[PDB]
């Protein structure tokens, strides 16, 4: 009662045969059927724009603070909503920036703990 062997597994535990690849199809409740996990070579489509036709990078257009997404390497708008930090800093769940040394080291630090919100492998 499961997809065919060559099927592609989705990140939300959902199952989608190889034909629902990054193709603009919201089939995964978490929108990540078109992310680097399944579309590990291309970017999502609609509800997420293209930052690199040469790599796997799709993000939600909401970071177009200048009317464009320029995040080729997440440099122009990383955490552009909350606070604009410098891409060379550790993006906080609230947008804040701290030293990359506080990157989820299994210990809270930036605000409360979100700094490690599901920071597992």
Q: Which stretch binds Ca ion (CB under 5 A): 1-9, 47-55, 70-78, 85-93?
A: 70-78
Q: Does 77 bind Ca ion (CB under 5 A)?
A: yes
Look up tokens 């947008």; give the residue.
Answer: 95
Stretch near Ca ion under the rule CB under 5 A, chosen from 35-43, 52-60, 68-76, 90-98: 68-76
Distance in Å, CB of 114 to Ca ion, minimum: 10
How far apart are alpha carbons 121 and 91 in whole angstroms?
A: 18
Among 82, 99, 105, 111, binds Ca ion (CB under 5 A): 105
Using CB under 5 A, which of 9, 11, 15, 25 touches Ca ion?
25
Q: How far is the CB of 5 from Ca ion (least distance, A)?
A: 20
> Considering only CA atoms, which of 56, 63, 67, 8 is closest in space to residue 45?
56
Binds Ca ion (CB under 5 A): choice among 32, 78, 90, 115: 115
d(CA 91, CA 58): 17
Please enumerate, as own/partner, the contacts of 30-35 that have beta carbons within 8 Å and a separation of 24 or more: 33/8, 34/58, 35/11
Name the residue among 110, 93, 114, 113 with its Cα closest to residue 101.
110
Binding site residues, Ca ion, CB under 5 A:
20, 23, 25, 27, 33, 64, 70, 76-77, 102, 104-105, 109, 115
């Amino acid at each position: 009662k499961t997809c065919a062997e060559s099927d592609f597994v989705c990140n939300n535990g959902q199952c989608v045969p190889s034909r629902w690849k990054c193709d603009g199809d919201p089939d995964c409740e978490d929108g990540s059927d078109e992310s680097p996990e399944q579309c590990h070579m291309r970017t999502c489509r609609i509800h997420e724009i293209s930052c690199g036709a040469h790599s796997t990078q799709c993000i939600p257009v909401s970071w177009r603070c200048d009317g464009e997404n320029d995040c080729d390497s997440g440099e122009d708008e990383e955490n552009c909503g909350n606070i604009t930090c410098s891409p060379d800093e550790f993006t906080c769940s609230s947008g804040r920036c701290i030293s990359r040394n506080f990157v989820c080291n299994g210990q809270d630090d930036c605000s409360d703990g979100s700094d490690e919100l599901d920071c597992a492998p």
